[PDB]
């Protein structure tokens, strides 16, 4: 399927133990996609002071369309030193590995895979 319904655990930035997916744009997009498939991916909502607490390259989920079954359609965009790889809509948040942190909420998304 080109899209997969996911419910992403929303983590507080200060709880996150593994603060990024790797060391290149291509690796972080790869790892993000693998963790999303494996149900081991969390979401941090981006506010003032969040991104400097996480590791670049960043992987964002961005709204790809204006929401089947409650699930917002999203796609992945990476960012490294202020350059983005991808073009999409509004940021829903930044993806990070999930290693058992307690979430504050869930974000229903339909991921273009």
Domain ranges of the chain: 3-112
Fold of 3-112: SH3 type barrels. (2.30.30)
| Ramachandran category for residue 98: left, alpha or beta (phi over 0 → left; psi -120 to 50 → alpha) | beta
- Please answer whether residues 35 and 98 qualify as being in contact, where contact means their C-beta atoms are separated by less than 8 angstroms: yes
Q: H or E segment at 92? A: strand 91-97
**3-state secondary structure at position 77:** strand
Contacts of 65 (CB under 8 A, 6+ apart): 73, 89
Q: Is the peptide bond before 48 cis (omega within 30 degrees of 0)?
A: no
**3-state secondary structure at position 70:** helix
- Provide the 10 A C-beta neighbour count for residue 99: 11
Listed resolution, Å: 1.8
Cα separation, 105 vs 103, whole angstroms: 6
Phi, psi of 101 (to 5 degrees): -55, 140
Phi, psi of 34 (to 5 degrees): -60, -50
**How far does Cα 53 stand from its chain's mean position?**
15
Closest CA to 73 of 24, 109, 46: 109
Closest CA to 54 of 63, 45, 62: 45
- Please answer whether residues 80 and 51 qualify as being in contact, where contact means their C-beta atoms are separated by less than 8 angstroms: no
- Provide the 10 A C-beta neighbour count for residue 23: 12
- Please answer whether residues 61 and 109 qualify as being in contact, where contact means their C-beta atoms are separated by less than 8 angstroms: yes
- Burial of residue 95 (CB within 10 Å: 0-12, 13-18, 19+) is buried
Experimental method: X-ray
Cα separation, 64 vs 50, whole angstroms: 23
């Amino acid at each position: 399927k080109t899209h997969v319904q996911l419910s992403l655990p929303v983590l507080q930035v200060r709880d996150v133990l593994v603060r990024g997916f790797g060391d290149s744009v291509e690796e972080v997009l790869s790892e993000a996609r693998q963790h999303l498939k494996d149900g081991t991916c969390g979401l941090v909502e981006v506010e003032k002071g969040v991104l400097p607490q996480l590791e670049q390259p960043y992987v964002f989920i961005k709204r790809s369309d204006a929401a089947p079954h409650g699930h917002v359609m999203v796609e992945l965009v990476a960012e490294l030193e202020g350059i983005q790889y991808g073009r999409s809509g509004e940021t829903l948040g930044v993806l990070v590995p999930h290693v058992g942190e307690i979430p504050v909420a869930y974000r229903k998304v339909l991921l273009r895979k």
